[PDB]
């Protein structure tokens, strides 16, 4: 029959229990302990610059006033009790549009100690902006983090720490993204002043390296076999006039194609990415192939042999420049 | 033990206060500051005539009914608490969908203060419309504002002010746009009168000056070399009819793709932009290129060479009337 | 980790141009800052410019009168300080702020600072 003990002991606690004032209001400010485990990240948007991230959000701290007596137990309650109970107020400040998921109920955790820990856990579906630096694009490396503070509490209010260290943040290895890899992970502390005062911040960051094996099939083997085909004109007998304009005229006109589609994949940046250099580079040769006949053709009404073997060391050349720059 | 008299002190506040009475009621109107911390301008669509803006909305107001004394300290209360406080019903009046963040509770502040001020901030990311005139485009300079009022209170009930004076908007550096950059914000009072009355009106407006850097080379460049392109059919002899023909064909299709790409990203307006004018009149270079062959066929069955310098001459003459007019 | 150095102070009676260079991760910092620290006195914002844009702005004491541009090719950013004053006898810093760092008048935000420069009027 301990039930009804133990429900005239959470009665007592909550009776005259006000969720209004923070524990040790007025005094020293409660320390809030974090850890987060990490679920996976769906999504990462370069045009939205932005990523999803489902994780279990946890909160430690301890309110004295809930400290109970005669039960040796860590009473887990209901979700639905935290409505009666005092919250730090955190947030998300990078984040673009986040919920809690409801399914079967409040994805929420409390679970109360006898010293007064409560423990609060929630889990979070977040998409948090990340700014992108796509020169490098797409052999570049990014460093997207998540900024965690609180939003009415002031660090005489509130402090925020992560509870064990580096060992706060899990989960890292469950991250699959096919197109990036998890380098690294880093957990930073710090205290963010604003006009209405300084606040606790914590800070989680990953650097994610793309993976180019799907941009090597995708966007280089096309613009490099185009660049290749371009040169079988050279092969072809000057006197076949069609032919050989024919040939440059599509090469030029399948590259457009090529570098359109690849810029619609991406936001409307001003300045130049690593690939565009590359297919700009690709659309110089092919339209110098094309003029190439038509300096032959002009002085016709050897020049072949030269552009054989000059047009593929160029190209060559450019190759290793390209690669040795951007690795 | 000072936590049971502060909860005296604010159930003392709260006790006989009616959220539905303004402050001041039936005398004086009251005064609302207001500042806005800009977090970030995640979106400018111009299909749409929206962008969307994410912010922290502070107001700052002084009510007496919730003054208290014997108190040297800020009272920064839960977020719920506000659910029992009358709050202005400001609300902006181009918006189109507007939210406030609740993770992991609702993005809100309360910050009593002895005197009666009471602080009340909001994290709001909003969409609000922006009309654009594309006419210079994308040359062109806009002009998107943020309008405030207040729904049912008249401007004898309430009044709005910008906190500060001119620094009452902070974090416009913080706006990263890749397209648009930040050339100047003003702050604007005013007040607007309806049939129902007067209204205290805020505006914020930003003045963006889109950058040229990707237009470039998405569409300015690749319409440039196809009409280098099909100059060299001036060069081919005039006997090859199957080259000559097809070199001026595919010159055309290119710019027709290229055009219906353009357009297919910016709204269905009647009038033409900039842009408009420039694929327009590289249309008719590759055109009149294409009968400037069938010309010469027909009086076959030196043209070419005066063709040569005309079409060059003509077309730098025409990039430079067009960007100095733009420009 | 971005690493500043500026130089171009001096003593003089006058116009003046500062300037500060920056090297390193500028992509996670995009925004600079200018310190001065008067003998005694607390550090002082002077004015802050972001890389990327060109917006800008000034405190109340040194508006209209010092004004601040960078140029991206040289990573560099300058401070032209016109009509100079008695007032402004302090040694200038330079400093960089991360992106979600906060405001721009909080030194205590920014986190790489330049060793300083010496400008006595």
């Known amino acids: 029959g301990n039930m009804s003990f133990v429900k005239e002991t959470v009665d007592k606690l909550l009776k005259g229990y006000d969720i209004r004032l923070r524990p040790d209001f007025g005094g020293p400010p409660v320390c809030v302990g974090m850890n987060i485990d990490i679920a996976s990240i769906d999504m990462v948007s370069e045009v939205n610059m932005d990523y999803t991230l489902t994780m279990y959000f946890q909160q430690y701290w301890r309110d004295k006033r809930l400290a109970y007596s005669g039960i040796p137990l860590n009473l887990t309650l209901d979700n639905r009790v935290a409505d009666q109970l005092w919250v730090p107020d955190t947030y998300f400040l990078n984040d673009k549009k986040s919920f809690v998921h409801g399914v079967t109920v409040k994805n929420r955790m409390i679970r109360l100690h006898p010293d007064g820990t409560v423990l609060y856990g929630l889990r979070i579906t977040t998409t948090a902006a990340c700014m992108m630096d796509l020169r490098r694009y797409p052999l570049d490396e990014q460093n997207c983090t998540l900024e965690i503070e609180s939003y009415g509490y002031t660090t005489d209010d509130i402090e925020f720490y992560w509870r064990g260290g580096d060992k706060a943040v899990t989960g890292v290895e469950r991250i699959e993204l096919p197109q990036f890899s998890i380098v690294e992970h880093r957990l930073v502390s710090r205290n963010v002043v604003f006009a209405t005062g300084a606040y606790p911040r914590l800070s989680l960051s990953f650097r994610l390296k793309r993976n180019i094996g799907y941009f090597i099939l995708q966007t280089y083997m096309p613009s490099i076999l185009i660049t290749i085909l371009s040169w079988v004109s050279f092969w072809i007998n000057y006197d076949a006039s069609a032919a050989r304009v024919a040939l440059g005229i599509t090469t030029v006109l399948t590259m457009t194609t090529i570098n359109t589609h690849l810029r619609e994949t991406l936001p409307k940046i001003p300045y130049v990415k690593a690939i565009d250099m590359y297919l700009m580079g690709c659309f110089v040769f092919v339209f110098l192939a094309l003029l190439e006949y038509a300096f032959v053709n002009y002085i016709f009404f050897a020049i072949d042999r030269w552009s054989r073997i000059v047009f593929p060391f160029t190209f060559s050349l450019f190759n290793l420049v390209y690669w040795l720059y951007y690795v | 033990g000072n936590m049971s008299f502060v909860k005296e002190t604010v159930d003392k506040l709260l006790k006989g206060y009616d959220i539905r009475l303004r402050p001041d009621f039936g005398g004086p109107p009251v005064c609302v500051g207001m500042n806005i911390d800009i977090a970030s301008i995640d979106m400018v669509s111009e299909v749409n005539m929206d962008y969307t803006l994410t912010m922290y909305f502070q107001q700052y107001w002084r009510d007496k009914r919730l003054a208290y004394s014997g108190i040297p300290l800020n009272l920064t209360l839960d977020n719920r608490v506000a659910d029992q406080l009358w709050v202005p019903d400001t609300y902006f009046l181009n918006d189109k969908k507007s939210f406030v963040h609740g993770v992991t509770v609702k993005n809100r502040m309360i910050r009593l203060h002895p005197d009666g001020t009471v602080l009340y901030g909001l994290r709001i990311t909003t969409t609000a419309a922006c009309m654009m005139d594309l006419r210079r485009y994308p040359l062109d300079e806009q002009n998107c504002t943020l309008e405030i009022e207040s729904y049912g209170y008249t401007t004898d009930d309430i009044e709005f002010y910008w906190r500060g004076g001119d620094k009452a908007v902070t974090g416009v550096e913080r706006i990263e746009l890749p397209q648009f950059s930040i050339v100047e914000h003003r702050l604007v009072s005013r007040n607007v009168v309806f049939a129902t009355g007067a209204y205290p009106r805020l505006s914020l407006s930003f003045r963006l000056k889109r950058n040229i850097g990707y237009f470039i080379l998405q569409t300015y460049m690749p319409s440039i070399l196809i009409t280098i392109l099909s100059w060299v059919s001036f060069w081919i002899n005039y006997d090859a009819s199957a080259a000559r023909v097809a070199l001026g064909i595919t010159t055309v299709l290119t710019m027709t793709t290229i055009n219906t790409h353009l357009r297919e990203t910016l709204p269905k307006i009647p009038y033409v932009k900039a842009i408009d004018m420039y694929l327009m009149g590289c249309f008719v270079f590759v055109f009149l290129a294409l009968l400037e062959y069938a010309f010469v066929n027909y009086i076959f069955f030196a043209i070419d060479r005066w063709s040569r310098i005309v079409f060059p001459f003509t077309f730098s003459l025409f990039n430079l009337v067009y960007w100095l007019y733009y420009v | 980790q971005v690493q500043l150095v500026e130089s171009g102070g001096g003593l003089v009676q006058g116009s003046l141009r500062l300037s500060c260079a920056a090297s390193?991760?500028?992509?996670?910092?995009?925004?600079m800052g200018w310190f001065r620290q008067a003998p005694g006195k607390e550090r002082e914002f002077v004015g802050a410019?972001?890389?990327?844009?060109?917006?800008?702005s000034y405190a109340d004491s040194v508006k209209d009168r010092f004004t601040i541009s960078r140029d991206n090719a040289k990573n560099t950013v300058y401070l032209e300080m016109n009509n100079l004053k008695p007032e402004d006898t302090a040694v200038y810093y330079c400093?960089?702020?991360?992106?979600?760092?906060?405001?721009?008048?909080?030194?205590?935000?920014?986190?790489?600072w330049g060793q300083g420069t010496q400008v006595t009027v």
């Open positions: 410019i972001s890389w990327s844009g060109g917006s800008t």
């Open positions: 400093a960089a702020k991360g992106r979600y760092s906060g405001g721009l008048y909080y030194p205590t935000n920014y986190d790489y």
């Open positions: 390193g991760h500028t992509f996670n910092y995009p925004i």
